[PDB]
Amino acid sequence: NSLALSLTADQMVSALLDAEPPILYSEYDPTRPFSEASMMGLLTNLADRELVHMINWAKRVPGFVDLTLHDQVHLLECAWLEILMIGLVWRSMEHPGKLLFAPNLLLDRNQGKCVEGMVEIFDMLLATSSRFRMMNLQGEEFVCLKSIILLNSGVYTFKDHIHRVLDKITDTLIHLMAKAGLTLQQQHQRLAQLLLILSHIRHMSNKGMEHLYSMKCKNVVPLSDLLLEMLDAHR
Amino acid sequence: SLALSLTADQMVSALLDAEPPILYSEYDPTRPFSEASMMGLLTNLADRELVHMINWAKRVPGFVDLTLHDQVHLLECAWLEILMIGLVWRSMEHPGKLLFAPNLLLDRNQGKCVEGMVEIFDMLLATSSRFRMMNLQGEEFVCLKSIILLNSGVYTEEKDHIHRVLDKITDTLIHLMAKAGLTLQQQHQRLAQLLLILSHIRHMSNKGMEHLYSMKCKNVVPLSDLLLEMLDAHR
Amino acid sequence: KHKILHRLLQDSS
Amino acid sequence: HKILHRLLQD
Numbered sequence: 452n453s454l455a456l457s458l459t460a461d462q463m464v465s466a467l468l469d470a471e472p473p474i475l476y477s478e479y480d481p482t483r484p485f486s487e488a489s490m491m492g493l494l495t496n497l498a499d500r501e502l503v504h505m506i507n508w509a510k511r512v513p514g515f516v517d518l519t520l521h522d523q524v525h526l527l528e529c530a531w532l533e534i535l536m537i538g539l540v541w542r543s544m545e546h547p548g549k550l551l552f553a554p555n556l557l558l559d560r561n562q563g564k565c566v567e568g569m570v571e572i573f574d575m576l577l578a579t580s581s582r583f584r585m586m587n588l589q590g591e592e593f594v595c596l597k598s599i600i601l602l603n604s605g606v607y608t609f610k611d612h613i614h615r616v617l618d619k620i621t622d623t624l625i626h627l628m629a630k631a632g633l634t635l636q637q638q639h640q641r642l643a644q645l646l647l648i649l650s651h652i653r654h655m656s657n658k659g660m661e662h663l664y665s666m667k668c669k670n671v672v673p674l675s676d677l678l679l680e681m682l683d684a685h686r
Numbered sequence: 687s688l689a690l691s692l693t694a695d696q697m698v699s700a701l702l703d704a705e706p707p708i709l710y711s712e713y714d715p716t717r718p719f720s721e722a723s724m725m726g727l728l729t730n731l732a733d734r735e736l737v738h739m740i741n742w743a744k745r746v747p748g749f750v751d752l753t754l755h756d757q758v759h760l761l762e763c764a765w766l767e768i769l770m771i772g773l774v775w776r777s778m779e780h781p782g783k784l785l786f787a788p789n790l791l792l793d794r795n796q797g798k799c800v801e802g803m804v805e806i807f808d809m810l811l812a813t814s815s816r817f818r819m820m821n822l823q824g825e826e827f828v829c830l831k832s833i834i835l836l837n838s839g840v841y842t843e844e845k846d847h848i849h850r851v852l853d854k855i856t857d858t859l860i861h862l863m864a865k866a867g868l869t870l871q872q873q874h875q876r877l878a879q880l881l882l883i884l885s886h887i888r889h890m891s892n893k894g895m896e897h898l899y900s901m902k903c904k905n906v907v908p909l910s911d912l913l914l915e916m917l918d919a920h921r
Numbered sequence: 922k923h924k925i926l927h928r929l930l931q932d933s934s
Numbered sequence: 935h936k937i938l939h940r941l942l943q944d
């Protein structure tokens with residue numbers, strides 16, 4: 452009953468590429484260095500604005516529209532930080548040693564020390580971005596991975612329809628690797644390598660969620676009502 | 687490395703032969719449950735299991751080729767994930783029940799005895815339900831548990847060898863599914879389904895680590911020295 | 922109201 | 935050395 456299952460692999464790729472959200476900018480104030488309140492303000496303001504575009508992207512992910520409102524809410528509440536972080540890691544891939552939060556907000560690990568307890572998260576994010584660069588991750592592979600996160604991360608906290616869509620995304624990832632000229636063995640090895648990184652992305656989100664929770668409790672930064680609700684979903 | 691010279695059947699045999707035994711709990715059936723006694727039962731069990739897990743890890747092909755510092759780091763990151771996938775595997779044919787031990791079978795209602803543990807019980811029970819809906823095989827389980835050991839800490843020079851062994855395990859998994867009569871499309875799909883579970887296993891381990899850290903700070907359960915060190919490694 | 926995420930998904934463009 | 939270290943070293 453879902454249109455997503457009749458899509459071919461090329462149609463799935465084209466749908467995800469067309470769904471991509473825009474790259475937002477940070478505020479243009481050149482005042483350096485950042486304080487802890489200043490940097491957490493920039494990072495949360497950017498994340499808050501990116502969340503609006505994520506909702507639009509998610510509704511364009513094949514199969515997401517066929518879910519009920521409650522199921523859509525659940526998947527997004529579960530994966531929202533994972534989704535921002537894989538996009539961040541993707542944007543930073545061509546910038547070794549740096550995190551491109553935005554085109555005018557390119558930070559290194561030392562600037563991660565501007566906020567207490569974030570340098571550990573910066574390092575994990577940087578190691579993930581380097582891993583993607585060393586794998587020569589392609590944009591077509593990236594959009595498949597980000598969609599997998601959306602559909603999978605909350606699927607075992609509720610499913611048949613979702614699992615069939617996830618299967619469709621796996622076929623699409625394999626088809627891209629076959630199209631690049633990989634052997635069958637190289638195809639499943641690479642598929643495993645990418646999916647295992649999603650375990651690390653989940654770890655980074657969980658650490659980032661506890662870090663964001665502490666910033667709210669420590670009243671470091673004003674968090675938007677949207678962010679407070681997305682954060683409150685993780686208890 | 688000698689692990690890279692193993693075929694797929696030799697890898698399964700080596701992993702199956704390395705399997706740790708199923709330990710019993712100190713569960714005194716006459717003793718009424720308290721929050722302290724149930725956490726005491728769970729942590730005492732985990733402490734005894736860690737000894738067997740350490741000697742199991744030595745028998746995982748490629749693990750002993752790593753420096754001693756690298757072995758410490760991998761087990762520090764993955765120990766609770768490994769314990770949990772083991773629990774979920776033991777509990778597969780016990781719907782609604784978690785088989786911590788043959789004499790310690792708990793449902794979600796008994797998890798309410800410990801504050802904050804029922805949310806973790808529900809996630810483990812759902813993972814067990816997913817393994818049962820997939821008819822996860824023992825040969826697939828031992829591959830997955832070894833993947834967790836090698837993957838979970840790999841991003842926190844000779845990591846190329848870790849990735850080389852990890853690929854050999856992917857080869858083994860496809861091999862098993864090919865031998866099970868699955869088509870090429872079904873093999874990659876099942877491979878993907880299995881590895882996405884590890885993202886959920888990371889989540890429960892993250893949540894379980896925070897919960898264990900709360901019982902320690904509350905002085906509820908007397909944690910063993912090894913368990914305390916394995917816990918401090920996540921801070 | 923209830924959830925901001927409710928209004929965002931219902932008004933998604 | 936850590937406990938884990940000694941047990942791995944045995």
Ligand SMILES: C[C@]12CC[C@H](c3ccc(O)cc3)C[C@@H]1CC[C@@H]2O
Nearest residue numbers: 494497498535536539572659662663
């Ligand atoms: C979660 C967090 C705020 C948002 C940050 C972020 C990440 C990606 C992104 O596109 C926007 C913002 C990541 C930070 C890590 C620690 C901090 O609390």
Ligand SMILES: C[C@]12CC[C@H](c3ccc(O)cc3)C[C@@H]1CC[C@@H]2O
Nearest residue numbers: 728731732769770773806894897898
């Ligand atoms: C992690 C935890 C103690 C260890 C428990 C456990 C013990 C042994 C085992 O093979 C699996 C799990 C799981 C509990 C869930 C909450 C509690 O903190």
